[PDB]
Amino acid sequence: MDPSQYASSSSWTSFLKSIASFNGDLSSLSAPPFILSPISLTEFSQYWAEHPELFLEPSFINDDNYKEHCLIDPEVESPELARMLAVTKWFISTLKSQYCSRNESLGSEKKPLNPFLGELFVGKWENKEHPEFGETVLLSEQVSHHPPVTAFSIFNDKNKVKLQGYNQIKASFTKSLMLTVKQFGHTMLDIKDESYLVTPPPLHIEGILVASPFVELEGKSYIQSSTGLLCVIEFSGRGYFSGKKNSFKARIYKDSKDSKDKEKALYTISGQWSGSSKIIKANKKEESRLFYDAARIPAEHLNVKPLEEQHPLESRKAWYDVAGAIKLGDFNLIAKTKTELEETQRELRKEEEAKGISWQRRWFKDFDYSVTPEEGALVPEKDDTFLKLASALNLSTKNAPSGTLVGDKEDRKEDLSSIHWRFQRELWDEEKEIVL
Numbered sequence: 001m002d003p004s005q006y007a008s009s010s011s012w013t014s015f016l017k018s019i020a021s022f023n024g025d026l027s028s029l030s031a032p033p034f035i036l037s038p039i040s041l042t043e044f045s046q047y048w049a050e051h052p053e054l055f056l057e058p059s060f061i062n063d064d065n066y067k068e069h070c071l072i073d074p075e076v077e078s079p080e081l082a083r084m085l086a087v088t089k090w091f092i093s094t095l096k097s098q099y100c101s102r103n104e105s106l107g108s109e110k111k112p113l114n115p116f117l118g119e120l121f122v123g124k125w126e127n128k129e130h131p132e133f134g135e136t137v138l139l140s141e142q143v144s145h146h147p148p149v150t151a152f153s154i155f156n157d158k159n160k161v162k163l164q165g166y167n168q169i170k171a172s173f174t175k176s177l178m179l180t181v182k183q184f185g186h187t188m189l190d191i192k193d194e195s196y197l198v199t200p201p202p203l204h205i206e207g208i209l210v211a212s213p214f215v216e217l218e219g220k221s222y223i224q225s226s227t228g229l230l231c232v233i234e235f236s237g238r239g240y241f242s243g244k245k246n247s248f249k250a251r252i253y254k255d256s257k258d259s260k261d262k263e264k265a266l267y268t269i270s271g272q273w274s275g276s277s278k279i280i281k282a283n284k285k286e287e288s289r290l291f292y293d294a295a296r297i298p299a300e301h302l303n304v305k306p307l308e309e310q311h312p313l314e315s316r317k318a319w320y321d322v323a324g325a326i327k328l329g330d331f332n333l334i335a336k337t338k339t340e341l342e343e344t345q346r347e348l349r350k351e352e353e354a355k356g357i358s359w360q361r362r363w364f365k366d367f368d369y370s371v372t373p374e375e376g377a378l379v380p381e382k383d384d385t386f387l388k389l390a391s392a393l394n395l396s397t398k399n400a401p402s403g404t405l406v407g408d409k410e411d412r413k414e415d416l417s418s419i420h421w422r423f424q425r426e427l428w429d430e431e432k433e434i435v436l
């Protein structure tokens, strides 16, 4: 049917009624075929680097050229600060990819495919137009199904720029049908020997009543560097803090201590992350400059090998029949293909439980950061990067919502674990079957 018919359709009415009895498992929502996406969440990891030049820019900034690598401020105080500005621009540039891609390609936000345990999604940005960039690899793996957890790593060996992180969410509906989503997990970006800890923001899904879902960000995201510098990004929508949706305000401070006082902000960036934003240095509000305009820079999608060459664990290969049925809008075929895949998985889980076997993750392992870790789990190292950056930001190391600070209510939750997924480059190095 035409989208204009969605809201009043029998299918949507039945869907809204199913929300009243939502059990907490988003995948249980009786969503109609017209609101289904043929893309698996394991693919979302690619959204961290769809602007190759911004992802790698920090690596080209050094003590001898930094003032030539800061468009908004040729008089930038230091290379560390020039790099923080670059990392911040990169972070902002990821937002349109992360939260607006389906609106563009599908017509609105839609229900993504719930990944199966073990699912993989790999590819690469060849950056053929920029030989100095080199190849950038994406590795994404579903390390958990109950609950859904996706781990990933994007790395550029040539320029020593590497990123790793993981993601999971917890969602609930308000009485007015707003879908509140809390993100969990974090992402770390290494630029040579300099590190950055990034925490995703919470969000809500609007437009459910009118059958035109869309993401709006809220709360805050942090970018803590090993240089001490810290960027605090606050999100808002519609009004309240800006006459336009998808708005944000980012402030860069010398350190976590200074972030307590907005007046100490070295720079203040404001605008829409899905559009244009300006930046002001210090308090010189009369000298704002364009920081980033999402509309001027088209996203660059990674190269994925043809289906014919994909391993059975690769997302698109495994979900092929389901994606095809979804595109066709065949109610019975969607139910059939999805059940076939998910039932086969349930069978595997039941067998493992009965045989005393456990699924082994391929390129990621879960490290127990608890003071009293499980006796068989891997534990972090002395100079663990997450530990030092979290300490600098005074960020909770527990499995609390992304961005939770030490002492916050969420951090004071009793019997809360501290297990985090980590990329093991060695496992990819010795990979014997998967290729790009």
Ligand SMILES: CC(C)CCC[C@@](C)(O)[C@H]1CC[C@H]2[C@@H]3CC=C4C[C@@H](O)CC[C@]4(C)[C@H]3CC[C@@]21C
Binding pocket: 026, 029, 031, 035, 041, 044, 045, 047, 098, 099, 109, 110, 111, 112, 167, 169, 171, 179, 181, 183, 205, 208, 213, 215
């Ligand atoms: C019809 C619709 C209400 C079905 C449910 C859709 C959904 C709530 O599952 C979707 C809609 C928006 C999706 C989010 C969009 C963007 C991201 C950023 C990515 O880095 C991690 C996944 C994450 C956080 C998605 C999780 C699943 C979400 C939240």
Ligand SMILES: [Pb+2]
Binding pocket: 366, 377
């Ligand atoms: Pb384990």
